[PDB]
């Protein structure tokens, strides 16, 4: 029964707060919260490997990929552990987020506590872009905001 939280911040107007909750080990993880300051439309949403914010979102490394798979969408079996797809921002620029994933975990080997949550400028193409950059990052573009994922009460 673990809980986690992430405060997302960047150089710009993108910011928000994302909660995680896992009532059972190896159970699904609820992920929910809100992000604001986004251009309308889809934005890539991933757990990156390192919780290193010493050089902004850049020092967070690549997508969290302990099983060395290709980048994919969260529904797929061929995906990085950190591949959480897209969030969607309305015309106000507010992406309400409410998803549930049993690939990530708040315990064990796929644990994401202490790693980085990142929201991107462009839409994640979910590994369908037909080039090798798609199978690596989904062409989500630059990192607009990030935060370290920390244990919550």
């Amino acid at each position, epitope marked *: 029964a673990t809980k986690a939280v992430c405060v997302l911040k960047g150089d710009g107007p993108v910011q928000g707060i994302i909660n995680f909750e896992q*009532k059972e080990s*190896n*159970g*699904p993880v609820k992920v929910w919260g809100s992000i604001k300051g986004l251009t309308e439309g889809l934005h890539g949403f991933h757990v990156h490997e390192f919780g290193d914010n010493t050089a902004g979102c850049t020092s967070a490394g690549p997508h969290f990929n302990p099983l060395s798979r290709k980048h994919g969408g*969260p*529904k*797929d*079996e061929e995906r990085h552990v950190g591949d959480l*797809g897209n969030v*969607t921002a309305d015309k106000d620029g507010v992406a*309400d987020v*409410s*998803i*549930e*994933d*049993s*690939v990530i975990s708040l315990s064990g080997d796929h644990c994401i506590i202490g790693r980085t949550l990142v929201v991107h400028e462009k839409a994640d193409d979910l590994g369908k872009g037909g080039n090798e950059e798609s199978t690596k990052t989904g062409n989500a573009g630059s990192r607009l905001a990030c935060g370290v994922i920390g244990i919550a009460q």
Partner: nanobody
Amino acid sequence: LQESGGGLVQAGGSLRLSCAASGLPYRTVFMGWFRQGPGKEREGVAVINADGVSTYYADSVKGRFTISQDKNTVYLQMNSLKPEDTAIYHCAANHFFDYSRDPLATAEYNYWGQGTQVTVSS
């Protein structure tokens, strides 16, 4: 996704379907039942979340069908069956779900069962 139950039943009667997930890469987020009637498009019937409590029912089966969960098996108790319920019923599942999406839409599920015939006479 192994399905059991099904078959023929007279109108008004009851039938229990079940589906046990075996050997899946990760735990299921949603698991449930879709159906395809003669000549029609596959539609969602009932799904249930990993918590075993949160459910979604097509409007056409509300109050007659009840999905529940054990064994990581799900059960579909079908009561007051009508000829319009005749269909091939597929178990289905995912390991992720975006609650902005439609939980009874086929596109939100990529694990699937082989199918079960259900025929309601009269």
